[PDB]
Amino acid sequence: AKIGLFFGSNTGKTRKVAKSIKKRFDDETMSDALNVNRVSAEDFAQYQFLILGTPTLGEGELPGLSSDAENESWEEFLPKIEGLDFSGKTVALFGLGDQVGYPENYLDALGELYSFFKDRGAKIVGSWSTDGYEFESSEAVVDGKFVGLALDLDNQSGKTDERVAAWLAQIAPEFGLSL
Numbered sequence: 001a002k003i004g005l006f007f008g009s010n011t012g013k014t015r016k017v018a019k020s021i022k023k024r025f026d027d028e029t030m031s032d033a034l035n036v037n038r039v040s041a042e043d044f045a046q047y048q049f050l051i052l053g054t055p056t057l058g059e060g061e062l063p064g065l066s067s068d069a070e071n072e073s074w075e076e077f078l079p080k081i082e083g084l085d086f087s088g089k090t091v092a093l094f095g096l097g098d099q100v101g102y103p104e105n106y107l108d109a110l111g112e113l114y115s116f117f118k119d120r121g122a123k124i125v126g127s128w129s130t131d132g133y134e135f136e137s138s139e140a141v142v143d144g145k146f147v148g149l150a151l152d153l154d155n156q157s158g159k160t161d162e163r164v165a166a167w168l169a170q171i172a173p174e175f176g177l178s179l
């Protein structure tokens, strides 16, 4: 495929969303939703376009063994690609979180994921408005706007489809989609 779709998940929501995204694209436009659990750093570097999802766990951290995820995830995968350069590549990020139970850490993992690739020279697209969200602070917020799509299936499952469709429409030009 042309667009690499990757995600990290412990209870399956981020995965659900990922498959939802891939639901509207070709097996030539986008690859299947893949868990970083089984991705080779070699297989990940091949994509010049990336769509990445991640929830935020224990202590506003990325899912992984330190955050008590059942199996490995973003935390352990990042070190495998930290030596990779993303200059000239395009990335879009989407995070899930619970704004009610974690008003001061809503989507922090998204923030950390943002920096990883941003620090690598990647072109990042898909900033999202904070309107419609109840939270106090987020490390995923830069200049009063989310660095990637903000989702909450714990308290706002009702707006997921609406949010996801609009976000896709928003990033389409940057991913050479006809959308």
Ligand SMILES: Cc1cc2nc3c(=O)[nH]c(=O)nc-3n(C[C@H](O)[C@H](O)[C@H](O)COP(=O)(O)O)c2cc1C
Residues within 6 Å of the ligand: 008, 009, 010, 011, 012, 013, 014, 015, 054, 055, 056, 057, 058, 059, 060, 061, 096, 097, 098, 099, 102, 105, 106, 107, 108, 153, 154
């Ligand atoms: C121990 C625990 C800690 C969490 N901490 C945060 C947090 O700091 N910030 C946040 O925005 N969401 C937090 N969440 C919410 C999850 O990220 C959210 O439920 C998500 O939908 C789970 O995604 P998953 O099914 O892909 O694992 C936390 C959830 C659990 C169980």
